[PDB]
Ligand SMILES: OC[C@H]1O[C@H](OC[C@H]2O[C@H](O[C@]3(CO)O[C@H](CO)[C@@H](O)[C@@H]3O)[C@H](O)[C@@H](O)[C@@H]2O)[C@H](O)[C@@H](O)[C@H]1O
């Protein structure tokens with residue numbers, strides 16, 4: 001009966017996850033990108049569905065993060081997008097102990113190409129690898145260095 | 153509801169107040185035991201992001217290192233105590249499956265066995281290994297994990 005609001009910060013670069021174009025209501029299938037700007041159209045919330053699993057929700061639109069096409073077991077390099085649909089293939093967990101975002105089928109959210117310092121507008125993709133450039137922390141919109149609990 | 157069982161992953165035993173009371177006294181040891189009942193249900197009261205109080209549901213007492221030191225040494229016994237303060241802050245790491253104190257040590261079965269006998273004490277220890285792993289499960293489905301951050 002309450003969801004915190006937070007920024008998803010790419011730990012190595014200090015950039016954040018955005019809908020591409022920064023819209024308050026991104027069209028379905030809008031890519032999830034990295035970008036350095038901060039504003040309320042890149043705020044997110046986490047809608048808990050089942051223990052660790054839930055929906056990464058764009059605060060302004062209510063659309064949530066999907067592997068493009070909604071496959072349950074997406075291959076490496078599957079693009080992440082926003083979409084209004086809510087179902088089990090858009091379930092992720094926000095690992096705030098190991099600092100990563102993991103999909104229910106076991107791959108992680110990465111910047112495409114795996115750079116520690118990706119350009120603005122770099123796409124995000126699913127990938128099974130674990131390394132410093134797929135780490136993310138979840139921080140206050142009022143203080144981008146203050147971690148906040150996404151599970152309440 | 154918001155209650156859960158703290159299950160020792162390797163043995164399937166659970167965290168209990170020693171003696172299984174609904175109203176354990178201050179400084180009652182936290183032990184491992186195979187039984188299940190409402191007097192071994194726990195809750196977690198969030199204080200600051202990941203940090204909070206591990207709470208015995210029936211009594212409201214919370215988990216402390218015995219003596220309440222900020223940086224307790226290895227083998228410090230865990231107990232229940234009504235006091236609230238920052239040396240009783242833990243985080244419930246449901247990704248690595250362990251319970252970590254604010255100063256960085258973890259809750260262990262004393263002696264570190266993957267199959268501790270009933271009534272084995274719990275202690276703080278800085279090492280990480282299979283036998284200090286815990287998962288947090290539904291009272292009505294002892295194999296179903298539940299979210300302790302509420
Ligand atoms: O991408 C996340 C989305 O995946 C699934 O929906 C895919 C896509 O289907 C529809 O688009 C069409 C069908 O009209 O299918 C292809 C692309 O797959 C397009 O040529 C065409 O527009 C929907 O209209 C799209 O919005 C949708 O993204 C899945 O069904 C969704 O739940 C969601 O997971």
Ligand SMILES: OC[C@H]1O[C@H](OC[C@H]2O[C@H](O[C@]3(CO)O[C@H](CO)[C@@H](O)[C@@H]3O)[C@H](O)[C@@H](O)[C@@H]2O)[C@H](O)[C@@H](O)[C@H]1O
Nearest residue numbers: 076077110111112113114115125127129130131133134
């Ligand atoms: O996208 C996330 C993924 O990025 C990195 O892997 C990218 C890509 O690297 C390799 O492809 C090539 C092989 O020639 O290696 C360079 C590095 O990008 C590319 O120019 C070229 O396409 C792998 O063979 C691909 O499978 C891989 O997807 C990073 O290494 C991954 O850990 C991950 O972060």
Ligand SMILES: OC[C@H]1O[C@H](OC[C@H]2O[C@H](O[C@]3(CO)O[C@H](CO)[C@@H](O)[C@@H]3O)[C@H](O)[C@@H](O)[C@@H]2O)[C@H](O)[C@@H](O)[C@H]1O
Nearest residue numbers: 178179216217218219220221231233235236237239240
């Ligand atoms: O164990 C957790 C508890 O540790 C600290 O309290 C220690 C101890 O204090 C009182 O015990 C006695 C006897 O009444 O009082 C002195 C210290 O004031 C101790 O040497 C002696 O044992 C309490 O009656 C005990 O319950 C308590 O264990 C800390 O102060 C507490 O906040 C709590 O963290």
Ligand SMILES: [Ca+2]
Nearest residue numbers: 050051298299
């Ligand atoms: Ca749950």
